Protein backbone atom coordinates (compact mmCIF):
# COMPACT_ATOMS: atom_id res chain seq x y z
CA UNK A 1 0.00 0.00 0.00
CA UNK A 2 3.01 2.30 0.40
CA UNK A 3 4.53 1.68 -3.02
CA UNK A 4 1.17 2.56 -4.61
CA UNK A 5 1.03 5.82 -2.68
CA UNK A 6 4.55 6.66 -3.71
CA UNK A 7 3.79 5.76 -7.32
CA UNK A 8 0.92 8.21 -7.52
CA UNK A 9 3.09 10.95 -6.07
CA UNK A 10 5.53 10.09 -8.84
CA UNK A 11 2.77 10.33 -11.49
CA UNK A 12 1.66 13.59 -9.89
CA UNK A 13 5.20 14.96 -10.27
CA UNK A 14 5.29 13.98 -13.94
CA UNK A 15 1.83 15.45 -14.57
CA UNK A 16 2.78 18.73 -12.89
CA UNK A 17 6.05 18.97 -14.81
CA UNK A 18 4.11 18.31 -18.04
CA UNK A 19 1.66 21.12 -17.26
CA UNK A 20 4.47 23.53 -16.41
CA UNK A 21 6.61 22.89 -19.51
CA UNK A 22 3.93 21.70 -21.97
CA UNK A 23 5.88 18.47 -22.16
CA UNK A 24 4.68 14.92 -22.65
CA UNK A 25 6.90 12.85 -20.37
CA UNK A 26 5.41 9.44 -19.72
CA UNK A 27 5.91 7.98 -16.24
CA UNK A 28 7.58 4.55 -16.28
CA UNK A 29 8.66 3.74 -12.73
CA UNK A 30 10.00 4.87 -9.39
CA UNK A 31 13.59 3.83 -8.81
CA UNK A 32 14.19 5.46 -5.41
CA UNK A 33 11.92 7.10 -2.85
CA UNK A 34 12.54 8.79 0.48
CA UNK A 35 9.77 10.13 2.73
CA UNK A 36 10.95 12.85 5.10
CA UNK A 37 8.76 14.40 7.81
CA UNK A 38 9.94 17.89 8.76
CA UNK A 39 9.18 18.98 12.33
CA UNK A 40 11.26 22.16 12.39
CA UNK A 41 8.50 24.67 11.56
CA UNK A 42 5.11 25.73 12.96
CA UNK A 43 3.23 23.33 10.68
CA UNK A 44 4.15 19.70 10.06
CA UNK A 45 4.79 18.76 6.45
CA UNK A 46 6.29 15.89 4.49
CA UNK A 47 8.85 15.97 1.63
CA UNK A 48 9.14 13.16 -0.88
CA UNK A 49 12.48 12.81 -2.66
CA UNK A 50 11.81 10.70 -5.71
CA UNK A 51 14.03 9.37 -8.47
CA UNK A 52 11.81 8.18 -11.31
CA UNK A 53 12.12 6.99 -14.88
CA UNK A 54 9.98 8.49 -17.63
CA UNK A 55 10.03 8.43 -21.43
CA UNK A 56 10.92 11.58 -23.33
CA UNK A 57 10.45 11.07 -27.07
CA UNK A 58 10.66 7.32 -26.67
CA UNK A 59 13.89 7.48 -24.64
CA UNK A 60 13.89 6.52 -20.96
CA UNK A 61 15.55 9.09 -18.72
CA UNK A 62 15.93 9.50 -14.98
CA UNK A 63 14.52 12.46 -13.10
CA UNK A 64 14.82 13.72 -9.54
CA UNK A 65 11.64 15.23 -8.10
CA UNK A 66 10.76 16.83 -4.77
CA UNK A 67 7.14 16.79 -3.71
CA UNK A 68 5.88 18.81 -0.74
CA UNK A 69 2.90 17.38 1.09
CA UNK A 70 0.94 19.18 3.81
CA UNK A 71 0.93 17.38 7.17
CA UNK A 72 1.41 13.59 7.18
CA UNK A 73 0.71 11.33 4.20
CA UNK A 74 -1.85 9.13 5.97
CA UNK A 75 -3.95 12.18 6.83
CA UNK A 76 -4.93 12.23 3.14
CA UNK A 77 -5.67 15.96 3.14
CA UNK A 78 -6.52 16.29 -0.54
CA UNK A 79 -4.71 16.80 -3.82
CA UNK A 80 -4.66 20.59 -3.40
CA UNK A 81 -2.33 20.26 -0.43
CA UNK A 82 0.59 18.85 -2.43
CA UNK A 83 3.17 20.75 -4.46
CA UNK A 84 5.88 19.84 -6.98
CA UNK A 85 8.82 21.91 -5.77
CA UNK A 86 11.53 20.58 -8.06
CA UNK A 87 11.79 18.30 -11.12
CA UNK A 88 15.05 17.95 -13.07
CA UNK A 89 17.11 15.44 -15.11
CA UNK A 90 19.71 13.57 -13.04
- The DSSP-derived string for 43-58 is S-EEEEEEEEEEESSS
Indicate the resolution in Å.
2.0
3-state secondary structure of 7: helix
Experimental method: X-ray
Long-range contacts of 7-10 (CB under 8 A, 24+ apart): 9/48, 9/50, 9/67, 9/69, 9/82, 10/50, 10/52, 10/65
Closest to 67 measured CA to CA, from 4, 20, 21, 8 = 8
The rounded distance, in Å, linking the Cα atoms of 20 and 18 is 5
Give the CATH number of the domain where residue 39 resides: 3.10.450.10
Element (H, E) at 84: strand 82-89
- Bridge partners (DSSP) of residue 89 are 63
The rounded distance, in Å, linking the Cα atoms of 43 and 83 is 15
Note down the domain range covering 75: 1-90
How many domains, the chain?
1
3-state secondary structure of 25: coil
The rounded distance, in Å, linking the Cα atoms of 52 and 49 is 10
Amino acid sequence: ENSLEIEELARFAVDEHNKKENALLEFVRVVKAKEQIDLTQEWVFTMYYLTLEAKDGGKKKLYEAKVWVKGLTNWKLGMNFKELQEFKPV
